[PDB]
Nucleic acid binder design. Structure first.
Ligand SMILES: [Mg+2]
Ligand SMILES: [Zn+2]
Ligand SMILES: [Zn+2]
Ligand SMILES: [Zn+2]
Ligand SMILES: [Zn+2]
Ligand SMILES: [Zn+2]
Ligand SMILES: [Zn+2]
Ligand SMILES: [Zn+2]
Ligand SMILES: [Zn+2]
Ligand SMILES: [Zn+2]
Ligand SMILES: [Zn+2]
Length: 277
DNA sequence: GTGGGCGTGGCACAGGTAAAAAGGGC
DNA sequence: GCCCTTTTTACCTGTGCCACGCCCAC
């Protein structure tokens, strides 16, 4: 047939596009209790909620979000039309937002520069400079009630609550497991299909996501940051050194309940215990 | 032949800044 | 609508758990 609206990937068959559109369904757990439309975050659902309010608003037809001013909606719609109406009058490069062009202008001469007093950061307006300057005074206005940790925004504070709640709203339809982030469900669903889009130029191995590719590459790079102060051996990961440190005291903290043998790391004990079972 | 030390794979994850995107006085 | 302000999401990379393949001691 053709492609998808959300992702846009071509499809040989219609049944392939439909079995693919169903993957978006798991990524959007915030469903409107009045019309069913679903969204990846409560913030975005709240944008959609305005269509059910008697107050005027301006809905985008293509994804059901609405705004309190027509100018907001029209600017927003450029995400769908792909228009880049703000052109650098000097080098010609085109951007979707005036805010993007403003930042880009610092790369050319004569821009208005908002330089940090205390480091080499520079910004295009005072509000951005001001927000950055909080990182020098240490002010983090949004504080977590459970642990006290401070955050730059209520969004970041919201996101961090996952450590206390364990909530996993993003559900896999094939196996049922839940995830804290839609991006991890996406990665998980790539693992189901063997869809490994990130490839290592040196050996060719493919991975489902950037972080697994990145750590893998350290084997080729020799990048072993954790060094043992006692014997000088280096490792890729903090927890190998941690286990190595143990190797020095000879502490085998894992013992088999059935036969009494002891092990240095839990995955040797765990492997050992399937000999019984 | 077997089992376990060893390094690294697979996985679900946090929290930082960069970037995108919504908000608003007039 | 301009001109920013303010909020929300993307991108990045280190993390610890157990699993897996390799290999040598036994
Ligand atoms: Mg400076
Ligand atoms: Zn799609
Ligand atoms: Zn609705
Ligand atoms: Zn839209
Ligand atoms: Zn330019
Ligand atoms: Zn600074
Ligand atoms: Zn907390
Ligand atoms: Zn699954
Ligand atoms: Zn490689
Ligand atoms: Zn050592
Ligand atoms: Zn045992």
């Amino acid at each position: 047939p053709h492609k998808c609206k959300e992702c846009g990937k071509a499809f040989h068959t219609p049944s392939q596009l439909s079995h693919h559109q169903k993957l978006h369904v798991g990524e959007k757990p915030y469903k409107c209790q009045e019309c069913g439309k679903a969204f990846p975050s409560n913030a975005q659902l709240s944008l959609h909620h305005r269509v059910h309010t008697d107050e005027k608003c301006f809905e985008c037809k293509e994804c059901g979000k609405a705004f309190m001013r027509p100018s907001h909606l029209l600017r927003h719609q450029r995400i769908h039309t792909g228009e880049k109406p703000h052109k650098c009058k000097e080098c010609g490069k085109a951007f979707r937002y005036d805010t993007q062009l403003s930042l880009h202008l610092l790369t050319h001469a004569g821009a208005r520069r908002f330089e940090c007093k205390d480091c080499d950061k520079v910004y295009s307006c005072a509000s951005q400079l001001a927000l950055h300057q909080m990182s020098h005074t240490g002010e983090k206005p949004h504080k977590c009630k459970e642990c006290g940790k401070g955050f730059i925004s209520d969004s970041h504070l919201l996101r961090h609550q996952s450590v206390h709640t364990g909530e996993t709203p993003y559900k896999c339809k094939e196996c049922g497991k839940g995830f804290r982030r839609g991006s991890e469900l996406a990665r998980h669903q790539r693992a189901h299909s063997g869809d490994k889009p990130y490839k290592c130029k040196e050996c060719g191995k493919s991975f489902t996501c950037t972080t697994e590719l990145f750590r893998h590459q350290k084997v080729h790079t020799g990048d072993r940051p954790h060094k043992c102060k006692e014997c000088g051996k280096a490792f890729i990961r903090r927890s190998e050194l941690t286990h190595h440190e143990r190797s020095h005291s000879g502490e085998k903290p894992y013992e088999c309940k059935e036969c009494g043998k002891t092990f240095g790391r839990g995955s040797e004990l765990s492997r050992h215990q399937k000999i019984h079972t």
